Design a binder for these strands. Structure first.
Ligand SMILES: [Zn+2]
Ligand SMILES: [Zn+2]
Length: 56
DNA sequence: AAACATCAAGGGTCCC
DNA sequence: GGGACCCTTGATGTTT
């Protein structure tokens, strides 16, 4: 596949568009927000699993 | 105080 | 590249 290097930590990350996920570990930015409980996450899949709690 | 289940953070991998 | 799911590890709560 393809790999990327972190500009901050120099750790090798395997991901095409997965670098921003590792970037949001140092700065802790949360662009995704829940519609109901307003809980914020740094990853789209993490927001999806939170939505799974609302609808059983 | 081991054994055990649960949740989440972080990374790998596939598929569209 | 974004969406989606899985694998590994550590903190926390149960239970006996
Ligand atoms: Zn980094
Ligand atoms: Zn919610």
């Amino acid at each position: 596949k393809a790999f990327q290097k972190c500009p901050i930590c120099e750790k090798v990350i395997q991901g095409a568009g997965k670098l921003p996920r590792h970037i949001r570990t140092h700065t802790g930015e949360k662009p995704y927000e829940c519609n109901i409980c307003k809980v914020r996450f740094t990853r789209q899949d993490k927001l999806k699993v939170h939505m799974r709690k609302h609808t059983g």
